[PDB]
């Protein structure tokens with residue numbers, strides 16, 4: 001008998017991945033699969049300049065909350081922790097490298113509870129209104145104390161990798177950038193027997209590239 | 222509110238049972254397809270029709286004996302301004318269909334031209350046996366008669382042979398619609414018709430793509446194509462590409478941006494032979510569509526060449542043989 005931490009605290013992951021520059025047989029008779037889209041970043045930043053439609057999508061998902069559903073969630077969480085009954089916000093978690101790659105003028109992410117994972121840095125090293133944690137456990141701890149809607153793992157390859165291995169992800173909002181770029185960090189390979197796509201959106205063009213959004217859901221059996 | 226959620230059940234009191242659905246097909250084989258909650262990728266417009274035909278199609282055998290599941294009247298829409306609808310659930314090549322398109326635009330009806338370019342789309346329709354069975358005993362091998370090309374540039378003229386120069390004979394529809402789009406864009410008569418009732422028996426076979434109607438709004442061009450007979454398993458995939466490409470061409474030479482491409486299907490059918498393969502396909506998840514780029518220097522519909530077209534970022538599943546016959 002047991003309840004899962006990912007269902008209780010509604011921890012999700014959101015990302016955008018382009019195709020990797022594998023010049024060797026990068027054309028011809030190359031096999032394709034969902035792992036074709038795995039380029040996360042290049043040299044501490046994004047492989048692409050600006051894909052506005054992905055940003056608008058990223059912002060809508062990470063800032064949207066349904067206040068008429070919170071109490072349902074509150075009860076659940078308080079029940080799991082064995083407890084009792086401003087504007088509601090979502091929580092966004094990011095690795096330190098992910099955080100520094102953000103333009104000062106956009107830190108911390110507006111209308112969101114910013115959480116940063118780091119060992120080398122501590123609260124005193126930040127001026128912004130953000131939470132600093134040094135273990136994945138502290139996030140769970142923090143989540144049990146805060147009033148929030150949903151929790152999104154904004155990323156960093158390292159951050160993505162460790163959250164998936166621990167199966168702390170309920171769903172993955174994956175943006176597929178249909179263009180190739182130079183990358184040095186990649187999204188972890190998703191195990192098909194653990195996560196399965198359940199939704200695929202319309203296809204769009206933005207800043208000279210097509211792209212779509214898909215959703216992976218954690219399987220049970 | 223939940224009162225009306227009850228009225229719904231009442232209004233669905235006469236809907237048939239899914240044993241009297243029609244075709245069993247066993248949709249347990251569509252594990253993945255039925256698991257998807259939201260299927261908003263445009264490729265599903267095609268895939269959903271294939272599912273609808275397999276589940277609700279009518280059983281019919283043709284004049285050959287081959288069997289099919291058919292339905293009547295479907296419509297698909299693709300936003301050409303957001304992508305190029307080249308199916309991703311199976312591998313497709315476009316060199317052949319583009320050459321066929323240029324072949325049409327030139328007004329050609331000579332099958333040897335395509336065969337010299339190693340395009341065999343019309344080979345079977347141009348044989349001695351095929352022509353003789355069409356009662357075209359006096360027709361030369363590979364002389365397809367007054368088909369698309371001929372009708373697009375010389376509708377109305379008397380067809381002689383594939384080597385004749387029909388210059389200034391018949392109506393040059395292609396030219397006419399390009400001019401209506403440029404000068405009278407709000408016109409509701411911008412149509413290109415290949416179905417020339419008088420020339421029907423003289424063609425290797427009647428056109429499957431009856432007509433194309435254009436629409437112009439705020440510098441954007443949309444196209445409706447009506448297909449009388451549609452082989453969902455093999456032809457439609459290519460047909461969607463052909464006309465999407467064509468709309469891009471017409472748009473450019475008229476100084477417009479490509480909007481929608483609308484595909485209307487009359488008799489839509491699936492060959493019993495393609496069923497196993499179509500099942501495989503429906504369980505593949507689409508990849509984002511690629512893009513189509515035209516050499517921007519081309520300004521006249523007749524000046525395009527094979528190297529003027531580029532399909533970029535085509536990600537797709539493994540090739541599939543709709544037949545699986547050996």
Ligand SMILES: NC(=O)C1=CN([C@@H]2O[C@H](COP(=O)(O)OP(=O)(O)OC[C@H]3O[C@@H](n4cnc5c(N)ncnc54)[C@H](OP(=O)(O)O)[C@@H]3O)[C@@H](O)[C@H]2O)C=CC1
Nearest residue numbers: 015016041044045095096098118119120155156157158159
């Ligand atoms: N396309 C997309 O959707 C995304 C792209 N990216 C790209 O990815 C790159 C960043 O990824 P990557 O280099 O992997 O870095 P991450 O952003 O994952 O940051 C890793 C760092 O976060 C900290 N950290 C991670 N896990 C823990 C933990 N369990 N406890 C304590 N601290 C932890 C550490 O900080 P410290 O070193 O201080 O101890 C660590 O070195 C960038 O180029 C960015 O642009 C990132 C997210 C999304």
Ligand SMILES: O=c1ccn([C@H]2C[C@H](O)[C@@H](COP(=O)(O)O)O2)c(=O)[nH]1
Nearest residue numbers: 426429450451452453455456457460
């Ligand atoms: O580009 C093409 C060419 C042919 N067909 C199919 C439709 C029919 O299955 C068959 C022609 O049969 P008739 O409808 O002409 O009888 O070829 C297509 O779907 N697309």
Ligand SMILES: COc1cc(NC(=N)NC(=N)N)cc(OC)c1
Nearest residue numbers: 014015016045046058154155175
């Ligand atoms: C390159 O660095 C980042 C990428 C994303 N984006 C995503 N996690 N996902 C997405 N764009 N869909 C978000 C970031 O900071 C808050 C940083």
